[PDB]
Design a protein around this ligand. Structure first.
Ligand SMILES: [Mg+2]
Ligand SMILES: [Mg+2]
Length: 1223
RNA sequence: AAUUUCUACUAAGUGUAGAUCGCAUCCAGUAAAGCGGC
DNA sequence: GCCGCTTTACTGGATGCGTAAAGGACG
DNA sequence: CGTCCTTTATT
């Protein structure tokens, strides 16, 4: 009611409506006969090609400067960049330095005198014909001699590359804003970690990577940046961090690889380096050597047959390798060795059937010498055997035969396994013989052929496992005696079997690539700017315009031969007529009023006083230090008079300008032109003539259509279908404008009609909803699946502009604060993320009362009494594992972004419904860049998509049921978030949306506000001794069977935050602990009081003795304290959760509230309408919402001039005094 | 199981409900398999 | 599980445009 | 000389 109505007509944004275009009458017949589509098809392919050559020239022009660029005073930027103490004056000083560094790069591209010609028709007619040396590339640019405006959008994408501003697509942005900070940040890390770099490691990287031409320390000096400005330098720089791969496959290690080895050997966390991003428009060949993938299906086959058949060496390698293990007994059992790795536990199984016997057998050997009888099994003796067992490089066949008990002979059972595994491979060929024949011809493309691939994948994985098994027998020796008679033959075969490793690589990279599909192609109809705008004065120029015949809108296109065929038409008084558009638009008043009145054609006709042309030149009409008021007034009066004397503007638009003496700036004037320089009207044009123009092929005509436009549809239209209707409805006083830049694509069919899944007519189809009481539909017509891709389809993308002239101008975050300061019962929505519930909603009133809370794991909807509850969290979990198991098995990877998107729209709808009902602000978690990472497989990508599509909705929120001409409807939709420019331009609040920190949101007691601010991990006995003494009392309360731990927080460290300070903790309830190593459960439920009684009996403590603090401190045993502090750890462990278990995720508190009862969320999850959180997840969203109620409390005090300056970012100390006082 | 398109439907018979900014460019991120060092 | 190289997939953020009339070249 | 494709102007 009150709050939302204020937010209408707030700002201007554009959207795009999409429509299927259906050819009318003989339209498509004439389009085929004139071969128009094949020309645009052949063009859209050549258009990608010409662009590729254009990139070649740009990259060449890009590099001429970037090779030769020198950055002035680079150290100065570095100096202020690494200062731990800049002021509000030096912070503005480094920025002005950062701006000049990009300018230094930017003007060097523009300093060239060929710069401006890179984006005009000259580059295609002139420059590229000179640069190119191919006679075919010369011929593909010539066909575009007539179309150079079809590149205007491509040229804009390339001037961004030469921008000076901090823009993401700028080259200057890449080198300075991105590469420098990454380069500087590593310079801070190099110095910190330079100590751990061996002198050979410096020489290793210098000889192998740097070629002795540069020192390694050089690439961390300030002045050496100039090398890395190109891809040539970046490729070398990244190699210093990561290393690279030679021809022979040697993994040359980089600095990030060495720092890693040191931190695994000294158990530290020293920082690794950040690689550098690529340079814009670089075609980057990678330094690491890799064998190129196969181009086509035929190559893959010819390799597969020739390399993998029995005749080829790869089989001969196995054929001889089987011979070696057969005669295995002959060679010296001291000469053969089995490598040591974690993969040997499998080896122990293959001989005698147990994993850990080889480890256990050896452990008996190491123990007996180095187990003195005093200890029997100290932690140091058990833990040192692990150090020795992996340090061992390999095992000889006799140390394994010595471990083996008779009659088991290791050398014989080795012959058994190899004989078992090479028999398997000879049988996979039996199935795959159909792949090896010379005659075999593939039925379907390799990607469309899941049946042939699974055959190759099965033969390749069978060869891979036999080779991967044998690799362990090398032993990496470096061994005193090797039966080199054996290993000589072995090395000969195994290096040749190693050839499959490159085939396994390259085949995977071919088969698993998405198959060929024909993208839709833009239709030009022989005009480079086809259908660019709708102005009636341009109808001949663009050659397309819109037509209306009642409830149906058509798109008419005029053939190049008959450009003015729809202008000679007139009204037919008696017979049918079309409604023809009369579109009129004045784009860019700041760029169209001076462009015309100072243009060569009209500069004479309107003789601007020499005073004028010196005002526009000096820019005194602009606000700032050049600003003059009367000059602005005079510039206005010249434009005003000139328009009245301009015919095609004055007649077309009805102009009302307020008195020039009332304009405060030139912007106020241009706005009135813009708001009134748009008029859409309709004229009458004969149908029998226009239709004659379609049959004659002089005019092409499609119907604009979606399923709402069907005569069989009686249901609520799609939201965009409403927009389309308002564009031409006479109640749209400019709210939604018809913008230019429409496009028309052609998407050829991608599926065959005969191939489709069809539900045959008059045969019953089963309904999937178990709530739907009609489990069958019997239709009299066929239901083809994906029928929209079974036929060719025209596409029409029409951009629209909403609120191009915004009336209501004010700050939105400020206006939201204003109405919160005055709302008597404001509401807050709390939305909390999780991995057990994707999203949890909590709605609260101004007093923190819960009105609503439910999980959004499932979307529940009712229409006409037909409930349907979709389990989207299950749908996401199943599609995720349908891509995981797809990636493993080389099959098709299903798409999941749409499933997440379809979920959010159902979610977004629900929040907007809550926002409309309760007039509630929205509360989200303050998440920076780091939190996106997780330890388990996330759908938390849904959360990032949840904000984007929710913010996008709140930019222009509409209800499709309200009247469009009413507030909230289609023409007056609510705008309650700041315009979405980027995710990085965001602050702590965005209109109704508040991002708030999550500290103490979940592990806090709702009933009392109690929080765990004690550190309980065990460090020493004395630390434990001081701990127990600090508590006011530790007693047993027998009437309740509980232990009581009264404390004043001021006796512990870092308890400054808490308000109440004095709490009494009780060992009430059970907790959940996770194991550290068969067993039914990986967790147990400890009973605290039944465990304090347990601990206190093991050490002989009389816990009934009143106060027990001095009694527990009397102990001298470390084991007592290391477990006591553990029991103390669980009592303060409020949030108890278990991975992947639906049952467990509960919050329980060890404090009695005002009525002396503990908060156990389980006592709430059973309730339908609970007044407190039901679980740790709802507890999160509840508090996220209350943290915002605190902020509303700060708005109710401050005054509207200072409401903008209130800090809504909670202080961790302020939130505790609030959570403890609210109850 | 239809769709401008996506999702979920069949929703009373060629459809229902919700959502939907297209296009081009630069760049990055995640997952998987192989490959080398701990 | 950490570090690094590759290849395939699918996915996502940040930029530009959403223009009529002047301007010029051309048969 | 009219027609079609190119460049332009910046609250
Ligand atoms: Mg509908
Ligand atoms: Mg995934």
């Amino acid at each position: 009611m009150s709050k939302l109505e204020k937010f209408t007509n707030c700002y201007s944004l554009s959207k795009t409506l999409r429509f299927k275009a259906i050819p009318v009458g003989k339209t498509q017949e004439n389009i085929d006969n004139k071969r128009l589509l094949v020309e645009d098809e052949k063009r859209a392919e050549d258009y990608k090609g010409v662009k590729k050559l254009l990139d070649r020239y740009y990259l060449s022009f890009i590099n001429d400067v970037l090779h030769s660029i020198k950055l002035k005073n680079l150290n100065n930027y570095i100096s202020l960049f690494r200062k731990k103490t800049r002021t509000e004056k030096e912070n503005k000083e480094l920025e002005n330095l950062e701006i000049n560094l990009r300018k230094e790069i930017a003007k060097a591209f523009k300093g060239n005198e060929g710069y401006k010609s890179l984006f005009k028709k000259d580059i295609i007619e002139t420059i590229l014909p000179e640069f190119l040396d191919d006679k075919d590339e010369i011929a593909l640019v010539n066909s575009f001699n007539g179309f150079t405006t079809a590149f205007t959008g491509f040229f804009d994408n390339r001037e961004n590359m030469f921008s000076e501003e901090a823009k993401s697509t700028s080259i200057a942005f890449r080198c300075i804003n991105e590469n420098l900070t990454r380069y500087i940040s590593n310079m801070d890390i190099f110095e910190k970690v330079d100590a751990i770099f061996d002198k050979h490691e410096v020489q290793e990287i210098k000889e192998k990577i740097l070629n002795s031409d540069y020192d390694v320390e050089d690439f961390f000096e300030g002045e050496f940046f100039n090398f890395v400005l190109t891809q040539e330098g970046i490729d070398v720089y990244n190699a210093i961090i990561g290393g690279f791969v030679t021809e022979s496959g040697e993994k040359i290690k980089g600095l990030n690889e060495y720092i890693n080895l040191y931190n695994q050997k000294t158990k530290q966390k020293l920082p690794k380096f950040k690689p550098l991003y690529k340079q814009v428009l670089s075609d980057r060949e990678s330094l690491s050597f890799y064998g190129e993938g196969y181009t086509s299906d035929e190559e893959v086959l010819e390799v597969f047959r020739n390399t993998l058949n029995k005749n080829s060496e790869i089989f001969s390698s196995i054929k001889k390798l089987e011979k070696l293990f057969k005669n295995f007994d002959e060679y010296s059992s001291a000469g053969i060795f089995v490598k040591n790795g974690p993969a040997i536990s499998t080896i122990s199984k293959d001989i005698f059937g147990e994993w850990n016997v080889i480890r256990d057998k050896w452990n008996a050997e190491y123990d007996d010498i180095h187990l003195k009888k005093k200890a029997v099994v100290t932690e140091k003796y058990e833990d040192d055997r692990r150090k020795s067992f992996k340090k061992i490089g390999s095992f000889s066949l006799e140390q394994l035969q010595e471990y083996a008990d008779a009659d088991l002979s290791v050398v014989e059972k080795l012959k058994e396994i190899i004989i078992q595994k090479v028999d398997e491979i000879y049988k996979v060929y039996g199935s795959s013989e159909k792949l090896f024949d010379a005659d075999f011809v593939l039925e379907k493309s390799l990607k469309k052929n899941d049946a042939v691939v699974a055959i190759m994948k099965d033969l390749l994985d069978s060869v891979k496992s036999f080779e991967n098994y044998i690799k362990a027998f090398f032993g990496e020796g470096k061994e005193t005696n090797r039966d080199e008679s054996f290993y000589g033959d072995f090395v000969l075969a195994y290096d040749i079997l190693l050839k499959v490793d490159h085939i396994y690589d390259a085949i995977r990279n071919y088969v698993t690539q998405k198959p060929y599909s024909k993208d839709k192609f833009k239709l030009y109809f022989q005009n480079p700017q086809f259908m660019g705008g709708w102005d009636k004065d341009k109808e001949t120029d663009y050659r397309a315009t819109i037509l209306r015949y009642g409830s149906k809108y058509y798109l008419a296109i005029m053939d190049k031969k008959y450009a003015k065929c729809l202008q000679k038409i007139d009204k037919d008084d008696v017979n049918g007529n079309y409604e023809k558009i009369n579109y009129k638009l004045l784009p860019g008043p700041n760029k169209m009023l001076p462009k015309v009145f100072f243009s060569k054609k009209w500069m004479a006709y309107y003789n601007p006083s020499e005073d004028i042309q010196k005002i526009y030149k000096n820019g005194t009409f602009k606000k700032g230090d050049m600003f003059n008021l009367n000059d602005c007034h005079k510039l206005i009066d010249f434009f005003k008079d000139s328009i009245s004397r301009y015919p095609k503007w004055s007649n077309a638009y009805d102009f009302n300008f307020s008195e020039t003496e009332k304009y405060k700036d030139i912007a106020g004037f241009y706005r009135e032109v813009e708001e009134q320089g748009y008029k859409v009207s309709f004229e009458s044009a004969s149908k029998k003539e226009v239709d004659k123009l379609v049959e004659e092929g002089k005019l092409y005509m499609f119907q604009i259509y979606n399923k709402d436009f069907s005569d069989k549809s009686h249901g609520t239209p799609n939201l965009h279908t409403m927009y389309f209707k308002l564009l031409f409805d006479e109640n749209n006083h400019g709210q939604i404008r018809l913008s230019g830049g429409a496009e028309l694509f052609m998407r050829r069919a991608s599926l065959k009609k005969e191939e489709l899944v069809v539900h045959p007519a008059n045969s019953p189809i089963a309904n999937k909803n178990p709530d739907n009481p009609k489990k069958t539909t019997t239709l009299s017509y066929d239901v083809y699946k994906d029928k929209r891709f079974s036929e060719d389809q025209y596409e029409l993308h029409i951009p629209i502009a909403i609120n191009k002239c915004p009336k209501n101008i004010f700050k939105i975050n400020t206006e939201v604060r204003v109405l919160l300061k005055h709302d008597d019962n404001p509401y807050v929505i709390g939305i909390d993320r999780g991995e057990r519930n994707l999203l949890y909603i909590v709605v609260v009133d101004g007093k923190g009362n819960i009105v609503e809370q439910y999980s959004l794991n499932e979307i529940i909807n009712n229409f006409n009494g037909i409930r349907i509850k979709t389990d989207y969290h299950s749908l996401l979990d199943k599609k995720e594992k349908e891509r995981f198991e797809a990636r493993q098995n080389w099959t098709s990877i299903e798409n999941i972004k749409e499933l997440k998107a379809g979920y959010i729209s159902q979610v977004v709808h629900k929040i907007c419904e809550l926002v409309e009902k309760y007039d509630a602000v929205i509360a989200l978690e303050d998440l920076n860049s780091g939190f996106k990472n997780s330890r388990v497989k996330v759908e938390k990508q849904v959360y990032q998509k949840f904000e984007k599509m929710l913010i996008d909705k709140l930019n222009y929120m509409v209800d499709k049921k309200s009247n469009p001409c009413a507030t909230g409807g289609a023409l007056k939709g609510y705008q309650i978030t700041n315009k979405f420019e980027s995710f990085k331009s965001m602050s702590t609040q965005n209109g109704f949306i508040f991002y708030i920190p999550a500290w103490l949101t979940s592990k806090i007691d709702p009933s009392t506000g109690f929080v765990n601010l004690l550190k309980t991990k065990y460090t020493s006995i004395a630390d434990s001794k001081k701990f127990i003494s600090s508590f006011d009392r530790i007693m047993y309360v027998p009437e309740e069977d509980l232990f009581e731990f009264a404390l004043d927080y001021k006796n512990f460290s870092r308890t400054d935050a808490d308000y109440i300070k004095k709490w009494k903790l009780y060992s009430y309830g059970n907790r959940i602990r996770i194991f550290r190593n068969n067993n039914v459960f990986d967790w147990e439920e400890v009973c605290l009081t039944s465990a304090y009684k347990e601990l206190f009996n093991k050490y002989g403590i009389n816990y009934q003795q009143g106060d027990i603090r001095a009694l527990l401190c009397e102990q001298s045993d470390k084991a007592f304290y290391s477990s006591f502090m553990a029991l103390m750890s669980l009592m303060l462990q409020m949030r108890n959760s278990i991975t992947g278990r639906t049952d467990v995720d509960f919050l329980i508190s060890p404090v009695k509230n005002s009525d002396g009862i503990f908060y156990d969320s389980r006592n709430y999850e059973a309730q339908e309408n609970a007044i407190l959180p039901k679980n740790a997840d709802a507890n999160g969203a509840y508090n996220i919402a209350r943290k915002v109620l605190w902020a509303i409390g700060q708005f109710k005090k401050a005054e509207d001039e200072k409401l903008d300056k209130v800090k809504i970012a909670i202080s961790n100390k302020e939130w505790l005094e609030y959570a403890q006082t609210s109850v």
